[PDB]
Design a protein around this nucleic acid. Structure first.
Ligand SMILES: [Mg+2]
Ligand SMILES: [Mg+2]
Ligand SMILES: [Mg+2]
Ligand SMILES: [Mg+2]
Ligand SMILES: [Mg+2]
Ligand SMILES: [Mg+2]
Ligand SMILES: [Mg+2]
Ligand SMILES: [Mg+2]
Ligand SMILES: [Mg+2]
Ligand SMILES: [Mg+2]
Ligand SMILES: [Mg+2]
Ligand SMILES: [Mg+2]
Ligand SMILES: [Mg+2]
Ligand SMILES: [Mg+2]
Ligand SMILES: [Mg+2]
Ligand SMILES: [Mg+2]
Ligand SMILES: [Mg+2]
Ligand SMILES: [Mg+2]
Ligand SMILES: [Mg+2]
Ligand SMILES: [Mg+2]
Ligand SMILES: [Mg+2]
Ligand SMILES: [Mg+2]
Ligand SMILES: [Mg+2]
Ligand SMILES: [Mg+2]
Ligand SMILES: [Mg+2]
Ligand SMILES: [Mg+2]
Ligand SMILES: [Mg+2]
Ligand SMILES: [Mg+2]
Ligand SMILES: [Mg+2]
Ligand SMILES: [Mg+2]
Ligand SMILES: [Mg+2]
Ligand SMILES: [Mg+2]
Ligand SMILES: [Mg+2]
Ligand SMILES: [Mg+2]
Ligand SMILES: [Mg+2]
Ligand SMILES: [Mg+2]
Ligand SMILES: [Mg+2]
Ligand SMILES: [Mg+2]
Ligand SMILES: [Mg+2]
Ligand SMILES: [Mg+2]
Ligand SMILES: [Mg+2]
Ligand SMILES: [Mg+2]
Ligand SMILES: [Mg+2]
Lengths: 142, 103, 55, 110, 117
RNA sequence: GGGGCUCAAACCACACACCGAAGCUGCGGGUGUCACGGUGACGCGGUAGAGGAGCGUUCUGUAAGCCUGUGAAGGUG
RNA sequence: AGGGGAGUGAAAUAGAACCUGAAACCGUAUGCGUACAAGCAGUGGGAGCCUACUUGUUAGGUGACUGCGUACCUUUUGUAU
């Protein structure tokens, strides 16, 4: 009698669609990270990808509380001396709405080959529609 | 028909006609034993949860053999402190065959 | 300047992965049936059906 | 089948001679002789004689046609090496190693 | 009575080089490097016989938590209800029923919910 | 520590629940000391260092024996 | 030069650099893994594949993925240093 383990070949993956249309960035993102990892399933094992597929439709309408709309800053270094570059929440929504939700969720996942595989099941769009009507996602709240 | 029994400080999920290794028992080989410590018995779609223990249940098993597990090997090393010990271990077990489960 | 740790078996064999040799382009003298190098005179003295060195 | 031919104490390094051996492994003895006759390397001169003796061995000792053979096995081993002295500057001496090798080729009609 | 160490020293070396089978590079073919790898592997094995009991208990808890919330209850509320009423089944068996015997797990959870806790 | 956090995932009080060590309990084994005649009870991290018990190698006696070309020592699984 | 046969021999992988013939080191052949992945190279868990046969609660080879994890000796108050 050994403990059950999930085989990467016979896992079940469903599709969900989430509306980010008045949801806090960090509290929407924790529910996404749970579904992406599979923590909501009794068959969860730490070393296989047993999560679900998540689709986010209204990416640009996510919001932050307080003065974080202006003072929240995103940094990245280009690799050349003095190459630190920055941008804030107002500018990033105008430039790339999807990069806001993708960046939040990506930091809530493990940083290893399996973590990058959990990240490939998240689709983020900015319109009211997605191109995944064939896969027939079902609405998910929060 | 499966049941949950306690033996050797551990709990085992058991169905009839099953070979399993448990902690050492003081019973001669080829003899029969009973477990009067049953916490859950499930029959098809019906499940009988055990308030402390299920009242009126029993599981009968026959002792098959005795033996020792594979050797685990112990080393105790403290670096640059001029200390090293070493040991070996094989753990005794008892193999039983489950011959009956009644509710 | 000299190494600080000796290289491994795999580390030097990877460097030699670009050390393989290529094969020459040969051709057959149609009139005779003698294999020679492409665009060179045959080891007998024929080029494009013409004796050129009379051995 | 599987006729062999060995040359021991060939006066060349094993590393140098293994480049040529990798060119003829698996080919037909007809298209493998032309590859060695036109090679610029020196180990191809030496290995062209070992291959042509394994073919003759497969003829006289076994009665087999050349058109059916192929180079099934070829490998190069290391041999006894000579040690010499090379005088360097400021009175230092160095160890020179003159390496050799053993070349083995096998042909088979199967 | 002069003693030569040739036979006994080799016999002692080959015991270490047999335990270093499968190690990368010099760790499996030179005695000096292989000796340290065989000792270090023993240190890890002793330590990891304790983590094995920690790692599996965490895994069972993560599965009872996921299965209890399917029935509308957190893990910490389920343990309180089970302890309050009667149930003394392990986390190893509770995790197994969560995956395979989902009907029995629901019956257990409804017993813990009915205990007002 | 990072993501991220604003009727908080911050701070101040109170309440119940859970996680969490090689700690404690459970089951199975091995040892040291003491007592009674195998049982009990208390222990068993360790450098310098003290004390106790052993393995293996060469040679001598037991041995003018015993094993061995129907295969010794050695080598390799 | 060196080999392939044939012959002598109980035995030529006893062939004259000749009893046995280990390790470092160098190769050929088969099986599995490896080209989006960061670190003392192991250890705990673990799928898939290959082989053998007692045909899967088995044995052998490999170890995708994942939790923990900064060699040894010496000298020191103290070293991944
Ligand atoms: Mg040290
Ligand atoms: Mg270097
Ligand atoms: Mg240095
Ligand atoms: Mg290689
Ligand atoms: Mg090169
Ligand atoms: Mg001079
Ligand atoms: Mg050199
Ligand atoms: Mg390995
Ligand atoms: Mg080896
Ligand atoms: Mg040594
Ligand atoms: Mg409040
Ligand atoms: Mg514990
Ligand atoms: Mg203790
Ligand atoms: Mg005890
Ligand atoms: Mg002690
Ligand atoms: Mg203690
Ligand atoms: Mg004697
Ligand atoms: Mg024999
Ligand atoms: Mg002797
Ligand atoms: Mg022998
Ligand atoms: Mg032996
Ligand atoms: Mg021999
Ligand atoms: Mg001999
Ligand atoms: Mg010799
Ligand atoms: Mg010899
Ligand atoms: Mg003799
Ligand atoms: Mg060798
Ligand atoms: Mg290979
Ligand atoms: Mg990438
Ligand atoms: Mg890859
Ligand atoms: Mg690297
Ligand atoms: Mg990193
Ligand atoms: Mg690195
Ligand atoms: Mg394992
Ligand atoms: Mg196997
Ligand atoms: Mg592993
Ligand atoms: Mg690992
Ligand atoms: Mg680590
Ligand atoms: Mg030193
Ligand atoms: Mg000093
Ligand atoms: Mg100092
Ligand atoms: Mg330190
Ligand atoms: Mg160092």
């Amino acid at each position: 009698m050994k403990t059950y383990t999930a085989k990467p070949e016979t896992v079940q993956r469903d599709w969900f669609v989430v509306d980010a249309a008045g949801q806090t960035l960090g509290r929407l993102a924790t529910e996404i990270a749970r579904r992406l990892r599979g923590k909501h399933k009794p068959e969860y094992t730490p070393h296989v990808d047993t999560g679900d597929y998540i689709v986010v439709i209204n990416a640009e309408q996510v919001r932050v509380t307080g003065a974080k709309t202006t003072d929240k800053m995103y940094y990245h270094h280009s690799g050349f001396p003095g190459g630190i570059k920055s941008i804030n929440f107002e500018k990033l929504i105008a430039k790339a709405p999807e990069r806001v939700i993708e960046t939040a969720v990506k930091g809530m996942l493990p940083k290893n080959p399996l973590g990058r595989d959990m990240y490939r099941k998240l689709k983020v769009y900015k319109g009211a529609s997605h191109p995944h009507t064939a896969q027939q996602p079902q609405e998910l709240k929060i | 028909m499966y049941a949950v029994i306690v033996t050797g400080g551990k709990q085992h999920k058991v169905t009839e006609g099953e070979f399993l290794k448990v902690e050492k028992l003081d019973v001669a080989t080829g003899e029969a034993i009973d477990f009067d410590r049953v916490l859950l018995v499930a029959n098809g779609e019906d499940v009988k949860i055990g308030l402390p223990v299920v009242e009126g249940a029993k599981v009968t098993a026959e002792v098959v053999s005795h033996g020792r597990h594979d050797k685990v090997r112990i080393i105790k090393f403290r670096r640059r402190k001029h200390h090293m010990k070493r040991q070996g271990h094989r753990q005794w077990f008892t193999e039983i065959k489950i011959t009956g489960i009644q509710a | 300047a000299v190494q600080q740790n000796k290289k491994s078996r795999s580390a030097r064999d990877m460097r030699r992965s670009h050390d393989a040799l290529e094969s020459n382009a040969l051709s057959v003298e149609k009139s005779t049936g003698e294999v020679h190098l492409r665009h060179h005179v045959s080891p007998d003295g024929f080029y494009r059906g013409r004796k050129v060195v009379d051995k | 089948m599987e006729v062999a031919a060995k040359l021991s104490g060939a006066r060349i390094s094993a590393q140098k001679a293994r480049l040529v051996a990798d060119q003829i492994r698996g080919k037909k003895v007809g298209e493998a002789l032309n590859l060695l006759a036109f090679s610029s390397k020196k180990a191809a001169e030496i290995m062209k004689k070992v291959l042509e003796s394994a073919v003759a061995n497969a003829e006289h000792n076994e009665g087999a046609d050349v058109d059916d053979l192929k180079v099934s096995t070829v490998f190069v081993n290391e041999g006894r090496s000579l040690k010499r002295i090379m005088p360097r500057a400021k009175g230092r001496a160095d160890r020179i190693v003159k390496r050799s090798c053993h070349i083995t080729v096998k042909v088979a009609d199967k | 009575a002069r003693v030569k160490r040739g036979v006994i020293a080799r016999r002692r070396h080959k015991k270490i080089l047999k335990l270093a089978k499968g190690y990368y590079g010099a760790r499996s073919r030179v005695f000096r490097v292989a000796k340290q790898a065989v000792i270090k592997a023993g240190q890890y094995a002793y330590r990891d016989r304790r983590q094995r009991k920690r790692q599996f208990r965490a895994l069972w808890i993560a599965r009872i938590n996921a299965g209890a919330r399917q029935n509308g209850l957190s893990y910490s509320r389920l343990i309180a209800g089970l302890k309050k009423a009667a149930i003394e089944i392990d986390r190893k068996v509770l995790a197994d029923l969560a995956v395979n015997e989902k009907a029995a797990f629901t019956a257990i959870v409804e017993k813990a919910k009915a205990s007002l806790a």
